[PDB]
Structure 1
């Protein structure tokens, strides 16, 4: 059938590596990615001052769902902005309700906590975000570089972003497509 679709939610203070790596690798898989700006259509200042122009506002992108995966980058301030957003809450609850994949990296998974998403799952985060994520004991913590418990797919940091992205590709399109996308990247794996 038609190609699958990914929504990447881009907020001020996002970790730009954790944004670009998944966008790029998921597009290499032939999956249609929408980089959606939380605040609107305007360019977004990431944590290390890379400025990325989103494909659409979140307001507009939401209308074009549903998506096969919703992706939440990290960066402490980006994740905080995701956590505070009513629009993000709605999107994640819809995705959960419809049994769609949700993928979050670094501080990103803390937005799952904020929005009460995926309780009872095994999750990982950046080491520095563990205490925030674990407040209340609603998840079981993992130190795996990528963790996947059903439809909740989490990962740890900039340096796990390729593994994270490839896990999203594998979850959507299978092992063989992921292996094919992986090879030209020159990963040490």
Structure 2
């Protein structure tokens, strides 16, 4: 069957960090659910782009499990993800079932908040490094995309294509990732 992705969308999310992975994953034939943290209502992203989620997180979490859970960045978005009990439960379940978790920019700091994937090598946006590294629970990387087993992280809007294609490769393989990449006119 087709692989399934859950993208958790909170107020203040970085819209580029959100839309590039959603679009690229759908190009890869992944069934993507854009789930609104706060409900079914439109979400005001960090640069004021307003995105209508496919479902509330409350509803989407009942339609699990997912082959990947994706956390976009944006400082305020990531803080909302970090403060959410529902997000904690979803991430802990995904970790327990050995499923992929992918987070970009400030997004990985939600992994710290929910005590997910300690001991992994991770990257973040450079400005989010100190928050991520508080307590030394991860090892930091400056790679544009970092994958330590089932924890996949990346740095920012400018690494969003690389991040998305890494998710595609992890779920659907190298050939599909290459086929999806070519029409994008990347470097």
Other structure's SS at 2:17 match: helix
Rounded to whole Å, the distance in 1 between the matches of 2:62 and 2:148 is: 28
CA shift, 1:87, in A, is 0.1
- The one-character-per-residue Cα deviations of 1:61-100 (angstroms, maximum 9, x if unpaired) are 0000000000000000000000000000000000000000
Other structure's SS at 1:154 match: strand
CA shift, 1:48, in A, is 0.1
Other structure's SS at 1:104 match: strand
Aligned pair count? 187
CA shift, 1:187, in A, is 0.2
Other structure's SS at 1:170 match: helix
Rounded to whole Å, the distance in 1 between the matches of 2:3 and 2:168 is: 10
CA shift, 1:50, in A, is 0.1
Partner of 1:130: 129
CA shift, 1:35, in A, is 0.1
CA shift, 1:113, in A, is 0.1
CA shift, 1:4, in A, is 0.6
- The one-character-per-residue Cα deviations of 1:138-188 (angstroms, maximum 9, x if unpaired) are 000000000000000000000000000000000000000000000000000
CA shift, 1:21, in A, is 0.2
Q: Deviation above 2 Å: which 4+ runs of structure 1?
A: none
Partner of 1:173: 172
Other structure's SS at 2:159 match: helix
Partner of 2:144: 145
Rounded to whole Å, the distance in 2 between the matches of 1:110 and 1:99 is: 20
- The one-character-per-residue Cα deviations of 1:88-116 (angstroms, maximum 9, x if unpaired) are 00000000000000000000000000000
- The one-character-per-residue Cα deviations of 1:120-142 (angstroms, maximum 9, x if unpaired) are 00000000000000000000000
Other structure's SS at 1:3 match: coil
CA shift, 1:17, in A, is 0.2
- The one-character-per-residue Cα deviations of 1:15-48 (angstroms, maximum 9, x if unpaired) are 0000000000000000000000000000000000
Rounded to whole Å, the distance in 2 between the matches of 1:141 and 1:6 is: 26
Other structure's SS at 2:6 match: strand
Partner of 1:53: 52
Structure 1 unaligned spans of 5+:
none
Q: Which TM-score applies when normalising by structure 1?
A: 0.99
Other structure's SS at 1:27 match: helix
